[PDB]
């Protein structure tokens, strides 16, 4: 399972199980470039979020019901959606993943 591999491989589930996580299969620069695209509000009302003009290749990792540390279990879902990231700093880079649409 790609999700099981990448979550422990990326130090996300090496010390516990995370309920959900999203991976974007695009170049780093292409994702950083979203910080100057469609400005929209974040879920918390904050206004430093931006939506990508185009859909992107992503894989959603969701923990099944039979998942318990130390044996996490994820269901893998591949799709193409617009990503929403919060940006901050200089360079104005993405610091948080807000959502996919």
């Amino acid at each position: 399972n790609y999700c099981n591999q990448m979550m422990k491989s990326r130090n996300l589930t090496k010390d516990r199980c995370k309920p959900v996580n999203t991976f974007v299969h695009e170049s780093l620069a292409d994702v950083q470039a979203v910080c100057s695209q469609k400005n929209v509000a974040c879920k918390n009302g904050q206004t430093n979020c931006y939506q990508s003009y185009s859909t992107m290749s992503i894989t959603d990792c969701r923990e099944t019901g039979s998942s318990k540390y130390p044996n996490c279990a994820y269901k893998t879902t591949q799709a193409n959606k617009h990503i929403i990231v919060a940006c901050e700093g200089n360079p104005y880079v993405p610091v948080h993943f807000d959502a996919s649409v």
């Binding site: 996580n21 999203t22 991976f23 974007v24 700093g89 993943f97």
Partner: peptide, 15 residues
């Protein structure tokens, strides 16, 4: 140690 930009990258980027 790790910046928020670096953490976001390692957690969500699979280019």
């Amino acid at each position: 140690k790790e910046t928020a930009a670096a953490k976001l990258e390692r957690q969500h980027l699979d280019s």
